[PDB]
Design an enzyme around this catalytic site. Structure first.
Site, PDB file in Angstrom:
ATOM      1  CG  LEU A  23      -2.335   0.578   0.999  1.00 58.35           C
ATOM      2  CD1 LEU A  23      -3.193  -0.425   0.277  1.00 58.35           C
ATOM      3  CD2 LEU A  23      -2.978   0.972   2.305  1.00 58.35           C
ATOM      4  N   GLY A  24       1.225   1.781   1.163  1.00 60.22           N
ATOM      5  CA  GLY A  24       2.117   2.925   1.181  1.00 60.22           C
ATOM      6  C   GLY A  24       3.489   2.541   1.670  1.00 60.22           C
ATOM      7  CB  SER A  25       6.922   2.865   0.295  1.00 58.24           C
ATOM      8  OG  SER A  25       6.502   3.677  -0.800  1.00 58.24           O
ATOM      9  N   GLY A  26       7.260   4.642   2.420  1.00 58.31           N
ATOM     10  CA  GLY A  26       7.524   5.748   3.341  1.00 58.31           C
ATOM     11  C   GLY A  26       8.679   5.498   4.295  1.00 58.31           C
ATOM     12  CB  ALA A  27      11.033   7.900   5.880  1.00 55.62           C
ATOM     13  CG  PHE A  28       6.402   5.701   8.215  1.00 57.02           C
ATOM     14  CD1 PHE A  28       6.172   6.561   7.121  1.00 57.02           C
ATOM     15  CD2 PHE A  28       5.575   4.561   8.368  1.00 57.02           C
ATOM     16  CE1 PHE A  28       5.134   6.291   6.199  1.00 57.02           C
ATOM     17  CE2 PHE A  28       4.544   4.278   7.450  1.00 57.02           C
ATOM     18  CZ  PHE A  28       4.320   5.146   6.369  1.00 57.02           C
ATOM     19  CB  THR A  30       6.447  -0.905   4.333  1.00 56.42           C
ATOM     20  OG1 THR A  30       7.378  -0.188   3.525  1.00 56.42           O
ATOM     21  CG2 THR A  30       5.605  -1.787   3.410  1.00 56.42           C
ATOM     22  CE  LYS A  50       2.609   1.171  12.093  1.00 57.02           C
ATOM     23  NZ  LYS A  50       1.996   2.619  12.576  1.00 57.02           N
ATOM     24  CG  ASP A 142       0.493  11.846  15.523  1.00 55.39           C
ATOM     25  OD1 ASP A 142       0.638  10.860  14.792  1.00 55.39           O
ATOM     26  OD2 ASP A 142       0.720  13.009  15.133  1.00 55.39           O
ATOM     27  NE  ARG A 146       0.173  13.932   9.854  1.00 56.40           N
ATOM     28  CZ  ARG A 146       0.315  14.087  11.176  1.00 56.40           C
ATOM     29  NH1 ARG A 146       0.469  13.020  11.974  1.00 56.40           N
ATOM     30  NH2 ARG A 146       0.305  15.312  11.702  1.00 56.40           N
ATOM     31  CG  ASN A 147      -2.301   9.937  12.360  1.00 53.97           C
ATOM     32  OD1 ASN A 147      -1.624  10.712  13.044  1.00 53.97           O
ATOM     33  ND2 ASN A 147      -1.769   9.152  11.419  1.00 53.97           N
TER      34      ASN A 147
END
Ligand SMILES: [Cl-]
Length: 310
Positions: A23-28, A30, A50, A142, A146-147
């Site tokens: 789905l989404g990659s990203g630095a944090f 996957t 996740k 948080d 986006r959450n």
């Protein structure tokens, strides 16, 4: 703190997840997408998996298990439930898939089609969601567009409990470590005293509502983070969005009041927006409102319908 947490953490076999597709990659990390097919059950549950990057550096495995611990301790229609974990190489969080993704992206990519009925309704659902977390003595820390994930355009749930914290019947605050929390969503006492409280979530809620009302804008798109503190100190706040009546904007401002206790309670926000949602064209003036929003699989059940004791 006192009541025992008799939640159940469920460990799931890596051989129960077919049809995986990043789905989404990203630095944090996957997030994946797949199908969880409980062992010997004619059911296929659409899931997100996740696995946050940081290889195996145990530092990670902590965050991911704290996430899991919380996410496993929540039962509400407006908060994401942890389905279980997978003890593969590294840990994985397995949870109900939210097919339409982030509410942030969702508004960004649908502006000319989002009615007032929806925006106000989401604010209701996110307030409900938070009030729940208030009850379970739990400081999200948080909250942001986006959450909030989208299940269907009329049903959203809160997520990402990476910074969440449980409290106590004693405790009233959470005196954070070395901050690693977005400045543009955090209360002023959070940015000076590293204090977090339910009422601080309220502020973030205010900023979240600000994001939706503006269909995805970046809070303080200009200003850099080293400066946010100073601005709020002088009195500045987010502008009133175009589509926003004063009634709705004033609710946003009330959330951003210097005295935390003067902020609204989530149970008030539910009531307030709930009133508002009964006549959405009177609180939001959206040009064009009055708007429509959208192998084999016999055995598919949404997680929301896949239960089992508790
Ligand atoms: Cl962004």
């Amino acid at each position: 703190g006192e009541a025992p947490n008799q939640a159940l953490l469920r460990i799931l076999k890596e051989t129960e997840f077919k049809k995986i597709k990043v789905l989404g990659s990203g630095a944090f990390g996957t997030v994946y997408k797949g199908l969880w097919i409980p062992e010997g059950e004619k059911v296929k549950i659409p899931v997100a998996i996740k696995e946050l990057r940081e290889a195996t550096s145990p530092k990670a495995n902590k965050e991911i298990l704290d996430e899991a611990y919380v996410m496993a301790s929540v039962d509400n229609p407006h908060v994401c439930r942890l389905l279980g974990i997978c003890l593969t190489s590294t840990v994985q969080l397995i949870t109900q898939l939210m097919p339409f993704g982030c509410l942030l992206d969702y508004v960004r990519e649908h502006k000319d089609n989002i009615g007032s009925q929806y925006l106000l309704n989401w604010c209701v659902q996110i307030a409900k969601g938070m009030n729940y977390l208030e009850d379970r003595r739990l400081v999200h820390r948080d909250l942001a567009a986006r959450n909030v994930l989208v299940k269907t355009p009329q049903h959203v749930k809160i997520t990402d409990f990476g910074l969440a914290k449980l409290l106590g019947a004693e405790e009233k605050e959470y005196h954070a470590e070395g901050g690693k929390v977005p400045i543009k969503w955090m209360a002023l006492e959070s940015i000076l005293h590293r204090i977090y409280t339910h009422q601080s979530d309220v502020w973030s809620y205010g900023v979240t509502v600000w994001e939706l009302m503006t269909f995805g804008s970046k809070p303080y798109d200009g200003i850099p983070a080293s400066e946010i503190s100073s601005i709020l100190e002088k009195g500045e706040r987010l502008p009133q969005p175009p589509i926003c009546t004063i009634d709705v904007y004033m609710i946003m401002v009330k959330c951003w009041m210097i005295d935390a206790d003067s902020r609204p309670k989530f149970r008030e926000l539910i009531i307030e927006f709930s009133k508002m949602a009964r006549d959405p064209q009177r609180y939001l003036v959206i040009q064009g409102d009055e708007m429509h929003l959208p192998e084999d699989m016999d055995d598919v059940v949404d997680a929301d319908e896949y239960l089992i004791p508790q």
